[PDB]
Amino acid sequence: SAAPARPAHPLDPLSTAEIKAATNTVKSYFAGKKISFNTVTLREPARKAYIQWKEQGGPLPPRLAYYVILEAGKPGVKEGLVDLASLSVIETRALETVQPILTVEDLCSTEEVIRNDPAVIEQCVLSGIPANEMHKVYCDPWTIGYDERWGTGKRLQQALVYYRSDEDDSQYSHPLDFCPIVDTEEKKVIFIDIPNRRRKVSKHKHANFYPKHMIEKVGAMRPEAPPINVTQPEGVSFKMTGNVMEWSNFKFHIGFNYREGIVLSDVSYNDHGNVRPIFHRISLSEMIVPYGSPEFPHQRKHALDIGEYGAGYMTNPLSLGCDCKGVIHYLDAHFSDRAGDPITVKNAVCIHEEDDGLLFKHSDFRDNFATSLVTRATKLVVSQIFTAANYEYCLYWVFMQDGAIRLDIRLTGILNTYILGDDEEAGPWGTRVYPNVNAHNHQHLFSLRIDPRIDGDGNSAAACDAKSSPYPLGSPENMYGNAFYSEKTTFKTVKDSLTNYESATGRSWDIFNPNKVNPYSGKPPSYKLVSTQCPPLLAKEGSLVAKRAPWASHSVNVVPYKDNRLYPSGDHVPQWSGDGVRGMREWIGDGSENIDNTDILFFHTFGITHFPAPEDFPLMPAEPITLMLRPRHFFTENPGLDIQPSYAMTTSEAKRAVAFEGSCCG
Amino acid sequence: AAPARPAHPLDPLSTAEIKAATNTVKSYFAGKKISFNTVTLREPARKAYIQWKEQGGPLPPRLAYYVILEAGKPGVKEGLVDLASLSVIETRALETVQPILTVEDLCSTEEVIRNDPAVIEQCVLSGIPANEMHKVYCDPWTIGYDERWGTGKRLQQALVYYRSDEDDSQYSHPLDFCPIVDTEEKKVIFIDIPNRRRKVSKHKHANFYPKHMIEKVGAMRPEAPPINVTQPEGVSFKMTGNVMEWSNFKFHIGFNYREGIVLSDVSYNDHGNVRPIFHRISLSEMIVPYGSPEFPHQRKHALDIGEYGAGYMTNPLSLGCDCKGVIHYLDAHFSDRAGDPITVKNAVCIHEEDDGLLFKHSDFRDNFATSLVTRATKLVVSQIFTAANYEYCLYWVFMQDGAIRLDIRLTGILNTYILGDDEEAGPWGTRVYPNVNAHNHQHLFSLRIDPRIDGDGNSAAACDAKSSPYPLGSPENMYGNAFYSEKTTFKTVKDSLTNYESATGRSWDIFNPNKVNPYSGKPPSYKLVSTQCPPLLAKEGSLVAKRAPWASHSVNVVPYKDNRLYPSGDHVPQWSGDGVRGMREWIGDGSENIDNTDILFFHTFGITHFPAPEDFPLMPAEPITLMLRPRHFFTENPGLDIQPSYAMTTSEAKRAVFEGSCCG
Numbered sequence A: 001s002a003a004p005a006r007p008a009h010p011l012d013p014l015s016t017a018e019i020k021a022a023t024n025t026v027k028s029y030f031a032g033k034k035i036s037f038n039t040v041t042l043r044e045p046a047r048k049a050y051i052q053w054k055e056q057g058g059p060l061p062p063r064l065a066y067y068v069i070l071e072a073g074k075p076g077v078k079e080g081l082v083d084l085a086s087l088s089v090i091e092t093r094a095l096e097t098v099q100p101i102l103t104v105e106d107l108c109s110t111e112e113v114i115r116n117d118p119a120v121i122e123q124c125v126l127s128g129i130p131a132n133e134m135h136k137v138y139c140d141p142w143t144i145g146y147d148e149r150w151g152t153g154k155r156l157q158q159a160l161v162y163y164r165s166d167e168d169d170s171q172y173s174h175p176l177d178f179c180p181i182v183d184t185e186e187k188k189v190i191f192i193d194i195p196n197r198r199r200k201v202s203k204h205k206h207a208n209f210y211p212k213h214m215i216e217k218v219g220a221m222r223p224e225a226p227p228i229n230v231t232q233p234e235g236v237s238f239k240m241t242g243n244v245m246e247w248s249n250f251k252f253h254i255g256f257n258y259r260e261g262i263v264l265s266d267v268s269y270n271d272h273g274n275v276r277p278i279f280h281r282i283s284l285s286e287m288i289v290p291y292g293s294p295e296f297p298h299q300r301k302h303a304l305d306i307g308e309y310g311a312g313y314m315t316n317p318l319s320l321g322c323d324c325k326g327v328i329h330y331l332d333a334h335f336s337d338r339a340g341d342p343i344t345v346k347n348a349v350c351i352h353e354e355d356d357g358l359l360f361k362h363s364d365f366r367d368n369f370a371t372s373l374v375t376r377a378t379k380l381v382v383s384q385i386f387t388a389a390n391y392e393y394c395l396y397w398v399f400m401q402d403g404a405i406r407l408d409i410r411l412t413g414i415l416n417t418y419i420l421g422d423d424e425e426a427g428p429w430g431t432r433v434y435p436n437v438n439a440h441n442h443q444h445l446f447s448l449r450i451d452p453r454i455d456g457d458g459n460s461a462a463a464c465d466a467k468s469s470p471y472p473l474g475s476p477e478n479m480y481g482n483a484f485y486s487e488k489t490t491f492k493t494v495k496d497s498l499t500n501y502e503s504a505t506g507r508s509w510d511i512f513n514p515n516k517v518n519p520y521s522g523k524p525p526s527y528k529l530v531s532t533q534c535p536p537l538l539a540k541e542g543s544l545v546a547k548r549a550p551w552a553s554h555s556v557n558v559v560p561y562k563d564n565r566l567y568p569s570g571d572h573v574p575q576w577s578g579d580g581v582r583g584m585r586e587w588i589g590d591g592s593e594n595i596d597n598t599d600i601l602f603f604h605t606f607g608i609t610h611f612p613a614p615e616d617f618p619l620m621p622a623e624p625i626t627l628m629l630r631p632r633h634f635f636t637e638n639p640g641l642d643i644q645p646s647y648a649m650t651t652s653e654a655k656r657a658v659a660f661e662g663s664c665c666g
Numbered sequence B: 001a002a003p004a005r006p007a008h009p010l011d012p013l014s015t016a017e018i019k020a021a022t023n024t025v026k027s028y029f030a031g032k033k034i035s036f037n038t039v040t041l042r043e044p045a046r047k048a049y050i051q052w053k054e055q056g057g058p059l060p061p062r063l064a065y066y067v068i069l070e071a072g073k074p075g076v077k078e079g080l081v082d083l084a085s086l087s088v089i090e091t092r093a094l095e096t097v098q099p100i101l102t103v104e105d106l107c108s109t110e111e112v113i114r115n116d117p118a119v120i121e122q123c124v125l126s127g128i129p130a131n132e133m134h135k136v137y138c139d140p141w142t143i144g145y146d147e148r149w150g151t152g153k154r155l156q157q158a159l160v161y162y163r164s165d166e167d168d169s170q171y172s173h174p175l176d177f178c179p180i181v182d183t184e185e186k187k188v189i190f191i192d193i194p195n196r197r198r199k200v201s202k203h204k205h206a207n208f209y210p211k212h213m214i215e216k217v218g219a220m221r222p223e224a225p226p227i228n229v230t231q232p233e234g235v236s237f238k239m240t241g242n243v244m245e246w247s248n249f250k251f252h253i254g255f256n257y258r259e260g261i262v263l264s265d266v267s268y269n270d271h272g273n274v275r276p277i278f279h280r281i282s283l284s285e286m287i288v289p290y291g292s293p294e295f296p297h298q299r300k301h302a303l304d305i306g307e308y309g310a311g312y313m314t315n316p317l318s319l320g321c322d323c324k325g326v327i328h329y330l331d332a333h334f335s336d337r338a339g340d341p342i343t344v345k346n347a348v349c350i351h352e353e354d355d356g357l358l359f360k361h362s363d364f365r366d367n368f369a370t371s372l373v374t375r376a377t378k379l380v381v382s383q384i385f386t387a388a389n390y391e392y393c394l395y396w397v398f399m400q401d402g403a404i405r406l407d408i409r410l411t412g413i414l415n416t417y418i419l420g421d422d423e424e425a426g427p428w429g430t431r432v433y434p435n436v437n438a439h440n441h442q443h444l445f446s447l448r449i450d451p452r453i454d455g456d457g458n459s460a461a462a463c464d465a466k467s468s469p470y471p472l473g474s475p476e477n478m479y480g481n482a483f484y485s486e487k488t489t490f491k492t493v494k495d496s497l498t499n500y501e502s503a504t505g506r507s508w509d510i511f512n513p514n515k516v517n518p519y520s521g522k523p524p525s526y527k528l529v530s531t532q533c534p535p536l537l538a539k540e541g542s543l544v545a546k547r548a549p550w551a552s553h554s555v556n557v558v559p560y561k562d563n564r565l566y567p568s569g570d571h572v573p574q575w576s577g578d579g580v581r582g583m584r585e586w587i588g589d590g591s592e593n594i595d596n597t598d599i600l601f602f603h604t605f606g607i608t609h610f611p612a613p614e615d616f617p618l619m620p621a622e623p624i625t626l627m628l629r630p631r632h633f634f635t636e637n638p639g640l641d642i643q644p645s646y647a648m649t650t651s652e653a654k655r656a657v658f659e660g661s662c663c664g
């Protein structure tokens, strides 16, 4: 065989050899044409085919690569599939009216283009920067997002322009007032948005943050603190076999791609020999970061970072014991560059276990707590950190010893900033965080995609709302007015599922298997989503934000499963106006399809609303986001009780250590 | 002849001061048979403390508050002792209240019920022979409130259970009936017996020690390889008595019988400018209302802080089990009924822990070679207390961005009641094991903040995210994306009575309207970021809502006055909830000014618990958290002078290794 070796596991990411085999296949299919590679990634097996292979002795699913290419002089993109075993293109089509994810190469070209463009140079000079100082001009290359002057007819970026007095400066204290529009493929500026009110470059010092800058600003650094050292002298408790993790009865596959970053698959829990599925797949599937200044051209700040840049493409190499402290297992990521050659991000994913405080404790007051049992918790963390120009997103998938799974996010990095004139008011749409610096209001919203398989196939979802009894105070049914219950609304059709978090009921959502019954409680096994960082989408209905991110206007969206329903703002996000039946809008359809007791997909919108303050500048302290999926009625008792306690003494042990009798303590 | 004065006016009473106070009170009431219920610091007046600390003012008097009972007299007496003069300076009799139930008060009840003929008869009817009363247990609760007796007797209710062996966890085997006990007479006065009898479960106990687990599931997991934490050069915090200094914070760590940990006089040293933040912060009350309407379960709504005391209930933490790493402990001291000091060793744990990343940024232009990373450390001041079945693990956390957070972990055992073989537990509870009904309930807490944000004269506000009122396609909001934060400053008490609202992602600011941040133009603040804010589910006019007037709003802001600590009143057990006391008194008619003055901010937070079998027989920790974050307090990130874990500038990276981007 001329073909690449098969992977250890059908969900493993393409290897570097597979990537090059796929791009050689595609270049040969398009021989004589000038093409460049935008995406070369695993096309995961169909859900049915994977489960049949894994659990039913079924066929080996074909090993497939999905590609996206551009061709010089042709609009839009072509996409397709390569069958790796046969080195052949098996599906292909041209999409002339979309634009694809912006890769690191696509973006890294823009600053050159603007520094050399005569119209940009003229605007720099009008803004107070001499023409021979263009090396001091920088830009963060953004997708244009959407601009109704061009649609998808050209592939465009917008350059958010800044100035550095010295290369070691943090540029964000010195935005310029104007916004060049760049044709990515022609490498040319095609327009510059210039405000009606000109604001020249700030004359203030840069707002810097390295130690040499801090010594100048505040006089000295704090002395190094005494260390806190973490060691695991007998190694770790988890076991990896390729990308497959085993830890504390969990087993799952750790995948990775250019767009979602980490993808956790085939998640099960070994309940005393009974290996019980939980999720087929869980990942972040899209984001949107909509800014809240209505002034032109700031409507074009609403990056969909996952679909427009890629949480894999943006991911940082983590080594070593700075980002991830302790004893660490790393994974690398592999992509294609534009030439079709593999590229590697070393140490893209960090895996480790950490102390997580107490798992459970109880002591008996009767012998003054001599009867006591204490068990400490350990958590497993699978992490990446990606950089979207100014911001850093730190992602932590956390498994815990009560069977819960949590996603923790920490936001850090730098505020997006725009220039503020000397006498200009930033509010109500932003904050003056430093002289002449306006940090606009914004949200950070994420779409968690869960493909559940709670205790096996055939699942449903529900909203669970705490409610007082409807019977009044002083009735026979509620004499003292204290009765309350959980109202469970099972979603029958897609439209039923379109629901928001509600503080008035402390709403949670269940994902459950209606085919099974817990023998104690009589309720179906479930994982419960406990999530309260669930902002409303503030942009209004019919806005460009709401149209491009149809998923973001509800906290929960549940649709039928179909293969290839990954990305809820569509497969090719940049420059889509938000008009059309694609992504989540397609999957919702008329709202009528069944989602009760079937294969479903559960997409959860969560995140934060950010009103900047000076504490966030020039570099932002981490701000946390979290959500939890908790087993409820899944087990018949606390699943962690077979973990050896940290301390345990029974009543009979404590007695030995020292009419009817009362309490020992009486 | 007086006790030594303490190092600091807010230090808790020493054992010597406790005994000096109870000797003074016994001499004042000479010839009378009295018992001690509470003997605790009466903290200095806020004005007197601040004057002493900051203005060279008078040393405040060192005072003890006491509560006593007298044999044959109703209610309590309470008063103050001036320690320097060994004299009672204030005293009064309150004949129609009942006070906190101490460990001694509660320790007695199981003896009483085991020996009571009517209880023995009910045990026999329930399937337990009369000569097996040593296998009958009860958790002694306050009666909470029962309209048959008011405050006219001091009462407990006994939640009764059965153990087949003393090492069992009893909660799989509740009995069906509820004795009512006169605490001071040590007698059963009544037994609530259900119309439907349910005899004791015949199932095995639902046990959780390793010997039980080996029998149940065959084997324990092997010991996991260790994770070891060491600080070979010591810790970065410094204590001087109860005064903590860490990462520019300075504060006093106090403790009492009722609130447990009390953090006082909290400041941040902003590059030599020592800026107040809070005068006092603590948990001031709780309520844990159950949601079964059936009699007598309406009496399960413990106000654990006011009825038992988070100090009285607190565990000795000794252990590198409860608190892992390099730990500083504090002891707690109280009085017993005889007036002798008692000690709980290792009541408070103090330590620092890694807390992940503080901040990071890298420049894509040189593929992240330009990078700065700084790791975070947190300071944790913790206690764990046991309220019979439940464990409450409390963690006050200071962080290096200037934020303060309170983290709680709930663990221990569900309250359980018996369920008949054919009885449905829902909708008010869950069958978590055969014949075991775990009723629905909430756990609610009242955080009390006495702020001094950047000094004296503070206000509070609700902050609501809102879309612009201008429509999509208007000149003012062409693309429909505009949004802002609507700040509603509370002018009078009534304005402050507000709930968390998911629809606006509501936060609350506590701010100083006399000052202005020179960059943003906004007042310095600490913002309460808190979303675990349940509605009170019990109806208006219910026992629960009347006894916990603070619990029906997420936020209550009132004027400061001295001695406004406890929002369900000073003597909680057996109060019906009728009357103008506690938070109801402090709210008054709602009209008093709370803008730019001395205020108190009481925040209700917690969870609503629908039990599931995972919670049984022993519950995995369930988290609750809230944060108070500086916003417009500093002019830049305050942590930037912490040494990075890693830093490389662009010029350094170039050395190590018009033009475009380096990576182009």
Ligand SMILES: [Co+2]
Residues within 6 Å of the ligand: A442, A444, A610
């Ligand atoms: Co932000």
Ligand SMILES: [Co+2]
Residues within 6 Å of the ligand: B410, B441, B443, B609
């Ligand atoms: Co509970």
